[PDB]
């Protein structure tokens, strides 16, 4: 193999998983006309409705929980209402009925911890809870979407460590795109798309970030956010509950290392959105889904410092995604960072 | 016809132009844990490289221009380099060579004006310049993308009134999606997609914002940003240079009214990204493009006030777009706003 060189002022790269192209402008500079107060988080606040013992907006009191805690969102985007007909059927005005369940999942009872500061056993409890909620809601819904939205820069105003889980009657757009691409690849090549992608990136080396006995982390060839990563198991695994105890402990360990590297990059608590994608569940869960491979995406906004971010606007809203930093530059910088968390 | 009622806690709506679905959660509330210095802009600053008479980063001096001014971006995402082979051809590592031209276009020589504060003749000069650059760059490139990125909230640090123009050797992803959908609709129905959409929204009324002799503005059925609009001509028109003098004056007038309504909504200078989509140009410009209809999109982030915005993150990055405010609520509020600009 040969490295992918930065020998042009612009080229385009393909995302085969979601079927889109990215414009890459290597070595492009910036000369902005003008440039672009963190109060300490108490360990317990009785007025924070994610804390043990606190009152929520529906009037219920949280228990004195030990590790994770799951509850129904009091302001939910989806609710388990009775089936009903589709409210509109004209070619240009198409609408369908929908239903679902939205949960909040606290990671830990203390508000002043984040995942990279938690111990490996504390993170294993999070992994076990992710598997449990996927089993439970997947019995009734074809798509269960676990996601974490971390930091004020992502619009998250409550600093307590947590994620959300939205299960839906419909397969969302991105899940449909990943179903189509993975199915077509397996029919043509006889192997799952992301198993072959893992094999090739291990041989090419230059986009790897971390490797462990059971997992790897890399910056995808087609990444759109500056320090975006992809996390996936080395074994062929369709859904999160299939992970063995050893695979779950190793996932907790490699997540701790990745998220500590992310905090060390600009010596700040690193914001992002992330989530998990696995084979659809629901009434067709027993069908053939061998084309699927479980994986997680991380989409972080920071670009050059704790204050200098990427804005996905303008040409990226009217035409297609664009980046300056190459994926090979990003991965090189991430590999070099220590796994010991910085201290002020 | 009958209004589209807000009678459920959730449903999904289809975008037939870009082929995607949106989750709509009518009447959903928010209870955030915590909540979410504008210096005066001088009319002329010799150190602002968009002003008449100022020195730019390449050392050249801007002329004393009268209305619009066009120049090559000194930090360009695309450059007109010599054709070259594609740097990679494996199924999972696909890349193609690319080339193009990036311009900056100042709207006016004074830095302390924005479009809604400009006169109708001043805005007509902008329309004429948009037509001219589309003709000129479309002779060599199949896609010319005009876009305006307005406001610090969109990452624009230079407050001088301006847009950008990026012409590319490739057809970008969104243009390919709109080519596919418009072509399929015309083959099946015998009329252009957006001409039929205009006809139906004029009959249904409830998503209209402004109507004039030659144009209309509406909130699309499938809109994703809170006060998103679509602007298009009433006549079937494939590309911007085809607009007649009367159509160009009327475009200047209706843009002034829309952007003044937008500023009046939260009594602030309203941020957004916008741009124009028309039939592809370049070497195939003479082929049959009757399925196309010229149009512009506006994508603004503000939701409830000058400080409270929508974040397209989390579930929207991992699954699909989601909104609380309905398109019918948004359009109703926009219709009621005065066309006289507010004053502090
Ligand atoms: P993260 O910030 O991603 O999610 C926290 C969620 O908690 C919901 N809340 C807040 C307050 C309350 O009393 N009940 C509740 O469910 C909030 O809407 C966020 O989605
Ligand atoms: P808007 O803020 O959308 O675009 C302004 C563009 O101007 C470019 N500049 C800035 C300074 C300079 O000396 N030359 C130049 O081309 C800047 O990169 C923005 O894209
Ligand atoms: Zn995925
Ligand atoms: Zn369009």
Whole-number Cα distances in Å, B150 to A333, B48, B217, B235, B305: 33, 17, 19, 29, 17
Q: Identify whether the C-beta of residue A78 lies closer than 8 Å to the C-beta of residue B52.
A: no
SS3 A188: helix
Which residues does a 6 A CB cutoff place in the pocket of ligand 2?
A 31; B 49, 56-57, 73-75, 104, 149, 156, 158, 162, 164
CA–CA dist B246, B302 (Å, integer): 33
CA–CA dist B216, B210 (Å, integer): 6
CA–CA dist A10, A211 (Å, integer): 31
Determine whether the annotation assigns residue A163 to a binding site.
no
Secondary structure letter of residue A344 according to DSSP: -
- The dihedral built from the CA positions of residue A10, A12, A13 and A15, taken in this order, carries a sign that is positive
Catalytic positions of B: 162
Answer yes or no: A291 catalytic: no
Candidates A132, A134, A120; CA nearest to A251 is: A120
Secondary structure letter of residue A123 according to DSSP: H
For strand B20-24 and strand B321-323, is the pairing parallel, antiparallel, or unpaired? Answer: parallel
A190 in reach of chain B (CB within 8 A): no
Helix (H) or strand (E) holding A103: strand A100-106
Fold exhibited by the domain A172-344: HIT family, subunit A (3.30.428)
Using only the alpha carbons of chain B, give its radius of gyration. Answer: 21
Which of A11, A90, A162, A236 does the annotation list as catalytic? A162
Determine whether the annotation assigns residue A160 to a binding site.
yes
Say if the Cβ atoms of B77 and A20 lie within 8 Å.
Answer: no
Six-digit token pair at A309?
A: 């971010």
Candidates B292, B340, B239; CA nearest to B17 is: B292
CA–CA dist A302, A226 (Å, integer): 7
Across A195-324, where does the E strand assignment appear?
208-211, 215-218, 229-233, 272-277, 295-299, 321-323
* Residue B216: HSE in the Cβ half-sphere, 13 Å Cα cutoff: 21
Domain spanning A35-171: CATH superfamily: HIT-like (3.30.428.10)
Q: Bridge partners of B144?
A: B167
Q: Bridge partners of B238?
A: none
Six-digit token pair at A150?
A: 């971390």
- Other C-beta atoms closer than 10 Å to the C-beta of A219 total 29
Candidates A245, A252, A239, A336; CA nearest to A292 is: A239
Six-digit token pair at B287?
A: 């082929």
SS3 A341: coil
- CB contact residues (below 8 A), chain B span 121-180, against chain A: 143, 145, 147, 149, 154-155, 157-159, 164, 166, 168, 170, 172-175
Domain extents in chain A? 35-171, 172-344
CA–CA dist A240, A238 (Å, integer): 7
CA A233 centroid distance within chain: 15
Residues for chain A: how many in total? 344
3-state secondary structure chain B: CCCCCCCCCCEEEEECCCCEEEEECCCCCCCCCCCCCCCCCCCCCCCCCCCCCCECCCCCECCCCCCCEEEECCCCCCCCCCCCCCCEEECCEEEEECCEEEEEEECCCCCCCCHHHCCHHHHHHHHHHHHHHHHHHHCCCCEEEEEEEECHHHCCCCCCCEEEEEEECCCCHHHHHHHHHHHHHHHHHCCCHHHHHHHHHHHHCCCEEEECCCEEEECCCCCCCCCCEEEEECCCCCCHHHCCHHHHHHHHHHHHHHHHHHHHHCCCCCCEEEEEECCCCHHHCCCCCCCCCCEEEEECCECCCCCCECCCCCHHHHCCEEECCCHHHHHHHHHHCCCCCCCC
Q: Identify whether the C-beta of residue A258 lies closer than 8 Å to the C-beta of residue A231.
A: yes
- CB contact residues (below 8 A), chain A span 101-120, against chain B: none
Q: Pick from A45, A46, A49, A166 the residue to mutate for probing ligand 1's pocket: most ligand atoms within 8 Å of its CB.
A: A49
CA–CA dist B311, A309 (Å, integer): 15
Q: Which residues contact A159 (CB under 8 A, 6 or more apart)?
A: A41, A111, B33
Q: Identify whether the C-beta of residue B229 lies closer than 8 Å to the C-beta of residue B275.
A: no
B218: left (phi > 0), else alpha (psi -120 to 50), else beta? Answer: beta
CB crowding B107-131: b at 16 or more within 10 Å, else e: bbbbbebbbbbbeeebbbbbbbbbb
Candidates A227, A240, A235, A164; CA nearest to A194 is: A235
CA–CA dist A196, A234 (Å, integer): 11
Residue with tokens 């915590």: B34
CA–CA dist A166, B210 (Å, integer): 37
Q: Bridge partners of A127?
A: none
SS3 A100: strand
Whole-number Cα distances in Å, A61 to A65, A69, A71: 11, 12, 11
CA–CA dist A161, A126 (Å, integer): 11
The angle formed by the CA atoms of residues B157, B161 and B163, to the nearest 5 degrees, is: 85
Q: Identify whether the C-beta of residue A147 lies closer than 8 Å to the C-beta of residue A299.
A: no
Six-digit token pair at A93?
A: 């005005």
Q: Pick from B29, B31, B36, B315 the residue to mutate for probing ligand 1's pocket: most ligand atoms within 8 Å of its CB.
A: B31
A35-171 and A172-344 share one CATH topology? yes
CA–CA dist A37, B6 (Å, integer): 41
CA–CA dist A22, A103 (Å, integer): 34
Q: Identify whether the C-beta of residue A180 lies closer than 8 Å to the C-beta of residue A188.
A: no
CA trace torsion B153, A172, A178, A10 (10° rounding): -20
CA–CA dist B49, B51 (Å, integer): 6
Q: Which residues of B touch A172 (CB under 8 A)?
A: 21, 23, 319-320
Whole-number Cα distances in Å, B17 to A231, B145, B175: 33, 17, 10
CA–CA dist A84, B114 (Å, integer): 48
Determine whether the annotation assigns residue A313 to a binding site.
yes
Say if the Cβ atoms of B149 and A100 lie within 8 Å.
Answer: no
Helix (H) or strand (E) holding A104: strand A100-106
CA of B266 to the centre of ligand 4 (A): 27
Whole-number Cα distances in Å, B167 to A74, A320, B128, B214: 48, 13, 18, 28
A296: left (phi > 0), else alpha (psi -120 to 50), else beta? Answer: beta
SS3 A39: coil
Secondary structure letter of residue A207 according to DSSP: T
Q: Which residues contact A102 (CB under 8 A, 6 or more apart)?
A: A72, A73, A76, A77, A78, A79, A164, A165, A166, A167
Q: Identify whether the C-beta of residue A11 lies closer than 8 Å to the C-beta of residue A320.
A: no
Which ligand 1 atom sits nearest the alpha carbon of residue A158?
2
CA–CA dist A118, A161 (Å, integer): 10
């Amino acid at each position: 193999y040969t490295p992918f060189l930065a020998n042009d002022h612009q080229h385009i790269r393909y995302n085969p998983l979601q079927d889109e192209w990215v414009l890459v402008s290597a070595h492009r500079m910036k000369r902005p006309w003008q440039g672009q107060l963190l109060k300490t988080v108490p360990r317990h606040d009785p007025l924070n409705p994610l804390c043990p013992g606190a009152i929520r907006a529906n009037g219920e009191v949280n228990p004195q929980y030990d590790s994770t805690f799951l509850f129904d969102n009091d302001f939910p985007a989806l609710q388990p209402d009775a089936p009903s007909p589709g409210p509109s059927d004209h070619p240009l005005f198409q609408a369908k009925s929908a239903r679902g369940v939205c949960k909040v999942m606290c990671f830990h009872p203390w508000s002043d911890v984040t995942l990279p500061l938690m111990s490996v056993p504390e993170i294993r409890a999070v992994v076990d809870a992710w598997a449990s909620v996927t089993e439970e809601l997947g019995a009734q819904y074809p798509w269960v979407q676990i996601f974490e939205n971390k930091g004020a820069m992502m619009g998250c105003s409550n600093p307590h460590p947590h994620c959300q889980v939205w299960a839906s009657s419909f397969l969302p757009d991105i899940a449909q795109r990943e179903e189509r691409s993975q199915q077509a690849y397996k029919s043509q090549h006889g192997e799952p798309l992301l198993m072959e992608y893992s094999r090739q990136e291990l041989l090419r080396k230059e986009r790897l970030v971390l490797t462990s006995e059971h997992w790897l982390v890399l910056v995808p060839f087609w990444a759109t956010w500056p320090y975006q990563t992809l996390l996936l198991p080395r074994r062929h695994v369709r859904r999160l509950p299939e992970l063995t105890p050893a695979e779950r402990d190793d996932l907790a360990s490699i997540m701790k290392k990745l998220l500590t590297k992310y905090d060390n990059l600009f010596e700040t608590s690193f914001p992002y959105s992330m989530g998990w994608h696995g084979a659809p569940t629901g009434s067709e869960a027993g069908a053939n889904w061998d084309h699927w491979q479980l994986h997680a995406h991380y989409y972080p906004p920071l670009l050059r410092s704790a204050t200098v971010r990427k804005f996905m606007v303008g040409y990226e809203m009217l035409a297609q995604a664009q980046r300056d930093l190459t994926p090979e530059q990003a991965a090189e910088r991430l590999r070099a960072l220590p796994e010991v968390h910085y201290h002020l």
